[PDB]
Design an enzyme around this catalytic site. Structure first.
Site, PDB file in Angstrom:
ATOM      1  N   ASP A   6      54.615 -51.650  88.097  1.00  0.00           N
ATOM      2  CA  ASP A   6      54.129 -51.589  89.580  1.00  0.00           C
ATOM      3  C   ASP A   6      52.692 -51.148  89.431  1.00  0.00           C
ATOM      4  OD1 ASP A   6      53.405 -50.888  92.112  1.00  0.00           O
ATOM      5  OD2 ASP A   6      54.203 -48.720  92.157  1.00  0.00           O
ATOM      6  N   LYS A  68      42.566 -53.918  93.230  1.00  0.00           N
ATOM      7  CA  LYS A  68      43.744 -54.572  93.747  1.00  0.00           C
ATOM      8  C   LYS A  68      43.370 -55.110  94.965  1.00  0.00           C
ATOM      9  CE  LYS A  68      48.698 -54.249  94.681  1.00  0.00           C
ATOM     10  NZ  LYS A  68      49.859 -53.406  94.624  1.00  0.00           N
ATOM     11  N   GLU A 145      57.014 -55.930  95.738  1.00  0.00           N
ATOM     12  CA  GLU A 145      57.215 -54.612  95.882  1.00  0.00           C
ATOM     13  C   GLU A 145      58.650 -54.064  96.738  1.00  0.00           C
ATOM     14  OE1 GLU A 145      53.242 -53.323  96.875  1.00  0.00           O
ATOM     15  OE2 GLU A 145      52.575 -53.966  94.933  1.00  0.00           O
ATOM     16  N   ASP A 166      57.183 -47.996 102.746  1.00  0.00           N
ATOM     17  CA  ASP A 166      56.150 -47.887 101.786  1.00  0.00           C
ATOM     18  C   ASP A 166      55.132 -47.115 102.063  1.00  0.00           C
ATOM     19  OD1 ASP A 166      54.781 -47.705  99.153  1.00  0.00           O
ATOM     20  OD2 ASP A 166      55.487 -50.042  98.856  1.00  0.00           O
TER      21      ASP A 166
END
Length: 349
Positions: A6, A68, A145, A166
């Protein structure tokens, strides 16, 4: 041998299988979460993770957070000698996760499944494989994800509609997955600038006002104090997921003569100065629903990703948006994607 990763905006985690069972590895600092922060000391030593986060503020210019967010770009940072493309930077977090997972297994690793957010594009997925390669790692496949999460809860029956809510440290994603035993992501939404770090931020602010109110001193201009406040603000947020109250006590935080910071934050107060952040979750949830053209009553399962889903308020909110449906529990909500990952990496290896 089968490992999943992850690679989060603010935290990354690495899971490996044992038997048909996922295990969440601990980093060299003893934590199952490793901040996604890479930094270059004024010497040339690369610090990755918590040791990077600790010094982010005193070495701002050589510290990269949320790399990211740059992945499918030509973004780069110039550190004395060379340019580092986003994949080069991510790689460093992968290298640290690599050295750390080897230690735990004693053996070596060379292949992993890596997760990606569902809205990524080819450039982005690719930037992700690149960083994989730059880190002496062979990226086997690469999944998104939400799918990872569902896999952690092994939701492969027949058909099903799954809601993945999430809430990470820096982002908020909500997806509606549909299951036939295949998994397609039907609708997506979120708020790219909505994360748990914001909840902690409000508490830091509250602490700054309350203090100023007492001492007439502005702490913002004091780095040491501020750092001390971030720590405290975080633990406070945490105690609040269980208690209806928490005390912040920071001995001799500054002077004029030392001054103690002593203040009590009620869960209710906390919820109040954070209400806008929470509400920011309605519209995206609602969107994903409308795209799909579904009544909430037709959601078969909801799985919560994100340590900040632990907050009572979110739970309560999710309950009402979902019509009273209880979310699955079992997997640490912020280990859930990495776990799904090691699982898919298992289907392969």
């Amino acid at each position: 041998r089968a490992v999943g990763i992850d690679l989060g905006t603010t935290n990354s985690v690495v899971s490996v299988l044992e038997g048909g069972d996922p295990v969440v590895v601990a980093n060299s600092e003893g934590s199952r979460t490793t901040p996604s922060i890479v930094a270059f000391a004024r010497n040339g030593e690369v610090l990755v993770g918590q040791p990077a986060k600790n010094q982010a503020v005193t070495n701002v210019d050589r510290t990269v957070r949320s790399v990211k967010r740059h992945m499918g770009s030509d973004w780069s940072i110039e550190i004395d000698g060379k340019k580092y493309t986003a994949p080069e930077i991510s790689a460093r977090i992968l290298m640290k996760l690599k050295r750390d997972a080897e230690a735990y297994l004693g053996e070596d690793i060379t292949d992993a499944v890596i997760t990606t957010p569902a809205y990524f594009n080819d450039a982005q997925r690719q930037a992700t494989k690149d960083a994989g390669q730059i880190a002496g790692l062979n990226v086997l496949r690469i999944v998104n994800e939400p799918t990872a999460a569902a896999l952690a809860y092994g939701l492969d029956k027949k058909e099903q509609r799954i809601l993945v809510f999430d809430l990470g440290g820096g982002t908020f994603d909500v997806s509606l997955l549909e299951i036939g035993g295949v998994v397609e992501v039907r609708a997506t939404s979120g708020d790219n600038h909505l994360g748990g770090d914001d909840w902690d931020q409000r508490v830091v602010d509250w602490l700054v006002d309350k203090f100023k109110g007492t001492s007439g001193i502005d702490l913002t201009k004091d780095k040491m104090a501020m750092q001390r406040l971030r720590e405290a603000a975080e633990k406070a947020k945490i105690e609040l997921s269980s208690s209806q109250s928490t005390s912040i006590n920071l001995p001799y935080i500054t002077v004029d003569n030392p001054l103690f910071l002593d203040e009590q934050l009620t869960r209710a107060e906390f919820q109040r100065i954070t209400q806008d952040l929470l509400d920011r979750t309605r519209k995206p949830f609602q969107s994903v629903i409308a795209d799909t053209g579904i009544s909430v009553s037709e959601i078969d399962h909801v799985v919560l990703v994100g340590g900040s889903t632990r907050m009572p308020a979110v739970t309560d909110l999710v309950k009402e948006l979902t019509g009273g449906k209880e979310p699955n529990k079992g997997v640490n909500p912020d280990e859930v994607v990495a776990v799904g990952a090691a699982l898919q990496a298992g289907v392969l290896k």
